[PDB]
């Protein structure tokens, strides 16, 4: 678990608990209309209830769609599943301003690679299901 990192919560009365915990940032992923994973749409509502900062974990095809979220909600970080493509990650940081960072979702594998994708702000675990590079 974490400091105040809660997964999609669309109840302001509920979300305020993380904001009250620090309003630092929450740990939500953009799963379309899930009450366990918040997407841009709930988040924008949620930020009117509990002004907590947002993060995202997504293997996106389009960089502009990541930029969209990074901009709209104003994220802090975004977790890229580097498995999508190597140069893709290298591209994200160019589009994404220094206000939003990138963390590399390190999936738990049999081997621990020293370097997979770097120039990322932080290394975190995989929260998108997987124990391999897929």
Buried b or exposed e, range 38-69, using 16+ CB within 10 angstroms:
bbbebbeebbebbebbbbbbbbbeeeeebbeb
What is the DSSP annotation of 52-117? --EEEEE--S-HHHHHHHIIIIIEEEEEE-GGG-HHHHHHHHHHS-TTSEEEEEE---SS--S-SS
Instruction: With CA atoms as reference, report the closest residue to 45 among 20, 61, 28, 58.
Output: 28
């Amino acid at each position: 678990m974490g400091e105040n990192k809660v997964c999609g919560l669309t109840r302001g009365q509920d979300a305020k608990a993380a904001y009250d915990a620090g309003a630092i940032y929450g740990g939500l992923i953009f799963v379309a209309t899930s009450p366990r994973c918040v997407n841009v749409e709930q988040a924008q509502e949620v930020m009117a209830a509990a002004p907590l900062q947002y993060v995202g974990v997504f293997r996106n095809h389009d960089i502009a769609d990541v930029v969209d979220k990074a901009k709209v909600l104003s994220l802090a970080a975004v977790q890229l599943h580097g498995n999508e493509e190597q140069l893709y990650i290298d591209t994200l940081r160019e589009a994404l301003p220094a206000h939003v960072a990138i963390w590399k979702a390190l999936s738990v594998g049999e081997t621990l690679p020293a370097r997979e994708f770097q120039h990322v702000d932080k290394y975190v675990l995989d929260n998108g299901q997987g124990g391999a590079g897929s």
